[PDB]
């Protein structure tokens, strides 16, 4: 299971996992505990599968949006940093990781999507989505293309969907109404329609994913991309002159990225709970840990006031936080994965051309309205956790029965010894 | 839309299938479009729930009971004359709750495929394959590689010693008696994971990696269906198709699939699709056209199977099929397959023990009544989608009714005028 005496850490393959593993060498070269940093596929879906059986990593890194489901499923340990540690991180980053009054993870860095443009194929990035087609017609005349970004994950297409009024769960009076879902409304329809019209007019391709878009931009084949800070590393080494700027407006309104706070939770099945705490607070969440990670793949606007006051002078970080301000902080409520799955389907099926935008989003709206899928999903993981726990109990009872069998055989040995002692003590009394 | 669009999976002979689409277009002039989208079996119900998707969908029969329960498949209406051209047991695979829900095309089963120059005889047992891999490793080769990402391919071994999906007895399936947890399933999956731990296979091998290695002569054995024989033909590896090895002395038990063609319930071209399938595909000419692209296996059309049955590769196919089981077509199959995919991937990667992986899958698959909620979801989507078409029509009707009312105004006023002129005329 989760071997005790070591820390295993999961973080997504696009993050600075090699830089994080350097913070693991320091932990291992300093405290002797070994640290293994892995980047599995579909990490956010494997974690609850294995953690439900007491397996998985000690620490799981993901944006805070997924952690409310992990918590409701009972898979997360209680985070308990001291008030002294709390004043080192911006309070709004602690806000992202608070669910029903408990801190369910440590905030690390603030992520938001920005516009990234090739400084030499385009001297000024377009201020509006609406001008991007004309730019692409011109740019293709030179053998290049205007824009390429990942169309497979709704994270990347939502800023445009949300611009004119799309929303996940209505947020009002400080609370989300999970039956007021806004993926159906006219704003959402107009955004996805513009996107599918871009595809159908041959300005982008529905088959484009993350790898194809990064390859295309870093080779000077596309004028613009949409991505987070992690992507800056690979663009640096391509010797492309790139700028990071505000996302284009749509119908006169800013694109609204959903803002992620990359967070570290501690597996509820971890025996190394306090070892994990010390790693995060006194190794990761410091200038040298964060800088080691950050120089692998930039983290974005880190939550630690100490190192952030230094990264904030990067113009790319300001442009990140300006885009972040125009968007909305993602909810962390359990229904987010259900929301994300509904919107993922819609975008792929509308982009593929085999469903209309109107039909795709009407389906997604009703699906997302079924947010009581997360109750069934949490109950499922809890029923796996229970059966696994009963199984450990039965193993213990076999151990106890074996021991009990040895004991009974020893008591038998003693019974026979006592027979002898009675015999010899009578033999001795008669010599007397 | 006056044309036929068809979905079929990318490992099938879609190029050959399109040739039958031309021969359809040259006779009726109707265009035939053959696409092989990824995850078609999962996209289909998403889009058909809103009245979209393809006209015809090709997949193994196991998925069609869920499509039918969600109300997304048209009732097939073969004439008694046409029904007697197909083996009756292939009709049973596509029969769900008394209705025929698709046309059967071909019977599929996995076989062992081995390099006859790397191996004089296929192994009789799974248990000897490690020793064989060692001997081969010393020569720069490997014993066995097959797709480990899809539970379809690992099931023959999982079932060998007693694993099963849903218990079948008295003619019906008990969807609460699930056999992915039992000692037979565990022993099969444990053997698979030990192969990986001992470096005889790699948990990341998938379909593409395994085919390449075998067709390049890099590995002595693979496990695959008939669709794969074409590419091995063009590679000039000397290969045999044979019965799978035994495990713990018992036959491997592959799940048998009947490639089937369903007709979308929202298709306006239902009769064209019927005509395409009955009188173009399901004939000695059409099945041969597909079969020459990528072999189909044992086709359902008695006339063309009589010829195929002479191919020893088809005999070995049918011998493997007989040791296995025809897959259920019940709605719970998708939940079953997803649960077992999870277990195999998580245990093969080493993140979970076999016991824990399969205990979780057992409890998941035991909740197969997520297919009832899932169908109820698709139906309420279909209903809401339909109500919107209705509301669009009713706007057209009210507009037309307003245009009418305005014309009745013109007529009323003309009659006023006529009254004036006709009395003024009676005075004159
Ligand atoms: O639904 C898409 C996806 O959006 C976010 O995932 C992001 C992640 O937050 C980023 O750090 C980066 O890794 O890209 C991911 C998308 O590819 C949500 O955090 C995630 O839950 C959601 O599924
Ligand atoms: O995966 C290759 C193989 O997959 C199919 O078998 C499926 C089954 O039919 C599906 O419902 C799926 O979810 O489970 C098995 C894969 O794990 C096809 O039957 C076969 O033709 C195709 O090549």
Numbering used by the authors:
A (entry chain B): 1 to 432
B (entry chain A): 4 to 431
Please quote the paper that reports this structure:
A coiled-coil domain (CCD) consists of two or more α-helices that are twisted around each other to form a superhelical structure. However, they are very versatile structural domains that can adopt many different structures. They can form different oligomeric complexes, and the helix orientation can either be parallel or antiparallel. To understand the detailed molecular functions of CC-containing proteins, it is absolutely necessary to determine the relative orientation of each coil, because the functional domain outside of a parallel CCD dimer must be in close proximity, whereas that outside an antiparallel CCD is located further away.
Only one out of six predictions was accurate in the case of antiparallel CCDs; the others were incorrect oligomeric structure predictions. The antiparallel CC proteins (MDV1, Mfn1, LMNA, BECN1, TRIM25, and TRIM5; see the legend in Table 1 for the full names of these proteins) usually formed aggregates or tetramers in solution. The short antiparallel CCD, MDV1, showed a significant proportion to be dimers, although the main fraction corresponded to a tetramer. If the fusion partner is a bigger monomeric protein, the molecular envelope is either Y-shaped (in the case of a parallel CC) or dumbbell-shaped (in the case of an antiparallel CC). In order to test an antiparallel CCD, we performed X-ray crystallography and SAXS of the MBP-MDV1 fusion protein. The results clearly showed that it has a dumbbell-shaped, rather than a Y-shaped, molecular envelope. These results were all consistent with those from our ACCORD method.
